[PDB]
Design a protein around this ligand. Sequence first.
Ligand SMILES: N=C(N)N1CCC[C@H]1C(=O)N1CCN(C(=O)N2C[C@H](CO)C[C@H](C(=O)Nc3ccc(Cl)c(F)c3)C2)CC1
Ligand SMILES: *[C@@H]1O[C@H](CO)[C@@H](O)[C@H](O)[C@H]1NC(C)=O
Ligand SMILES: *[C@@H]1O[C@H](CO)[C@@H](O)[C@H](O)[C@H]1NC(C)=O
Ligand SMILES: *[C@@H]1O[C@H](CO)[C@@H](O)[C@H](O)[C@H]1NC(C)=O
Ligand SMILES: *[C@@H]1O[C@H](CO)[C@@H](O)[C@H](O)[C@H]1NC(C)=O
Ligand SMILES: *[C@@H]1O[C@H](CO)[C@@H](O)[C@H](O)[C@H]1NC(C)=O
Ligand SMILES: *[C@@H]1O[C@H](CO)[C@@H](O)[C@H](O)[C@H]1NC(C)=O
Ligand SMILES: *[C@@H]1O[C@H](CO)[C@@H](O)[C@H](O)[C@H]1NC(C)=O
Ligand SMILES: *[C@@H]1O[C@H](CO)[C@@H](O)[C@H](O)[C@H]1NC(C)=O
Ligand SMILES: *[C@@H]1O[C@H](CO)[C@@H](O)[C@H](O)[C@H]1NC(C)=O
Length: 341
Amino acid sequence: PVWKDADTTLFCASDAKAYETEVHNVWATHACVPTDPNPQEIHLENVTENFNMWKNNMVEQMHEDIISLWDQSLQPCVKLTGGSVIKQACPKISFDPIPIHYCTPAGYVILKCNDKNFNGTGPCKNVSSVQCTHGIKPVVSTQLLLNGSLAEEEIIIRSENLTNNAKTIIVHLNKSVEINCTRPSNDIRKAYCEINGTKWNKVLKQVTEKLKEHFNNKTIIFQPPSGGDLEITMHSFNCRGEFFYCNTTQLFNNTCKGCNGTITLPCKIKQIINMWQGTGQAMYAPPIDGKINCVSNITGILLTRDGGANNTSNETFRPGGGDMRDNWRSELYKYKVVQIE
Ligand SMILES: N=C(N)N1CCC[C@H]1C(=O)N1CCN(C(=O)N2C[C@H](CO)C[C@H](C(=O)Nc3ccc(Cl)c(F)c3)C2)CC1
Ligand SMILES: *[C@@H]1O[C@H](CO)[C@@H](O)[C@H](O)[C@H]1NC(C)=O
Ligand SMILES: *[C@@H]1O[C@H](CO)[C@@H](O)[C@H](O)[C@H]1NC(C)=O
Ligand SMILES: *[C@@H]1O[C@H](CO)[C@@H](O)[C@H](O)[C@H]1NC(C)=O
Ligand SMILES: *[C@@H]1O[C@H](CO)[C@@H](O)[C@H](O)[C@H]1NC(C)=O
Ligand SMILES: *[C@@H]1O[C@H](CO)[C@@H](O)[C@H](O)[C@H]1NC(C)=O
Ligand SMILES: *[C@@H]1O[C@H](CO)[C@@H](O)[C@H](O)[C@H]1NC(C)=O
Ligand SMILES: *[C@@H]1O[C@H](CO)[C@@H](O)[C@H](O)[C@H]1NC(C)=O
Ligand SMILES: *[C@@H]1O[C@H](CO)[C@@H](O)[C@H](O)[C@H]1NC(C)=O
Ligand SMILES: *[C@@H]1O[C@H](CO)[C@@H](O)[C@H](O)[C@H]1NC(C)=O
């Protein structure tokens, strides 16, 4: 059993259904093979390996897959890019992400870190090997990570470098909080998301506790994003093919008193989007008729820390995504590819 750190082209595997018209199944049918019928996980005795989730080529490869998936599935009525405009066809699609497995070809293996407290960087003491990752749903979103896996013990704070304020922080929850979003059947663009504020505020208290530990028992304060475009100032995500933008100010107010019922976030279905794939603008068709509803699990939070305040008494955090690679990272963090030397 000898190996060395290496990079290589992965392949993908899924349980896509060949009869399904849903666009993730369509994509997986022709670009992935069926998932491993008998997956095998070999434990490595007294092996210690070093991982680095911020420098992991698997993330880059998943990003390209999802870009390609979106480019052949959600085609927009009009793409505006670098001076050129292109009008295409934009029929309403069936959209519901499915888990994708990433798998190494012959000569390579995936090492899997099984330390329950692992924060993404540093040495792992409980390593296994696998031919494929577990199945990861490629959920595109900002501010909140949805429908992901949970941390197994305590809330985990993940950052390439906590001291650097421009480094995005990933909070990995150990308890999911449901967010239930609805555009009622009968303003067709107006919608809302319902969160159990009791559940949310309690989990958010535990996040502050955890952030305290890393920040010298200082005063932890949350605040809405300090400007930017709507995809970053709002919790943005796609629901049955429709782009939802949800004001999360009520989630990131430190108030929490008589605040512990249901939190209704005001939302909008937008037709003009600032693409996350490549720089540009895409215009999609107005929303389908009827009740549009998505019930998801908040499994993590994307946070950006306010810079320039070392001699202040407190650290403020704001929600902030946009770089979808961090979404992939929050699930690939325990994997790394190695060449069997
Ligand atoms: N891809 C690579 N390799 N890179 C290199 C560094 C920068 C990045 C890059 O090159 N790019 C990233 C995206 N790019 C933007 O421009 N973004 C700015 C935009 C606000 O202006 C929002 C964008 C958004 O998150 N969109 C969004 C849309 C729908 C949903 Cl559902 C959603 F969750 C999110 C972020 C351009 C290319
Ligand atoms: C290591 O991880 C394995 C999962 O592969 C699990 O049995 C447990 O969390 C750990 N056990 C040992 C013996 O390290
Ligand atoms: C992650 O754990 C390593 C220990 O190997 C430590 O050096 C690093 O600072 C930790 N990072 C965070 C964000 O806790
Ligand atoms: C949401 O989380 C619950 C428990 O936290 C889990 O049983 C359920 O499968 C999750 N749903 C999705 C869609 O991931
Ligand atoms: C989640 O982690 C926090 C510490 O970050 C801990 O206080 C809490 O009890 C944990 N909850 C579960 C269900 O593991
Ligand atoms: C982390 O960021 C701080 C501030 O930007 C920097 O001074 C420090 O050297 C960084 N640490 C590493 C290991 O890069
Ligand atoms: C989600 O909210 C809608 C409208 O508020 C409601 O009709 C539906 O039953 C809710 N679903 C769940 C699973 O809570
Ligand atoms: C909200 O969550 C709490 C604790 O998780 C639960 O006890 C309560 O019943 C929930 N409220 C509603 C309206 O479901
Ligand atoms: C979100 O709602 C708050 C309160 O209604 C408002 O002040 C804020 O400007 C809203 N955010 C955006 C991006 O519109
Ligand atoms: C999360 O998973 C549920 C259950 O599979 C699905 O109905 C929902 O639309 C998903 N949410 C997102 C944003 O993909």
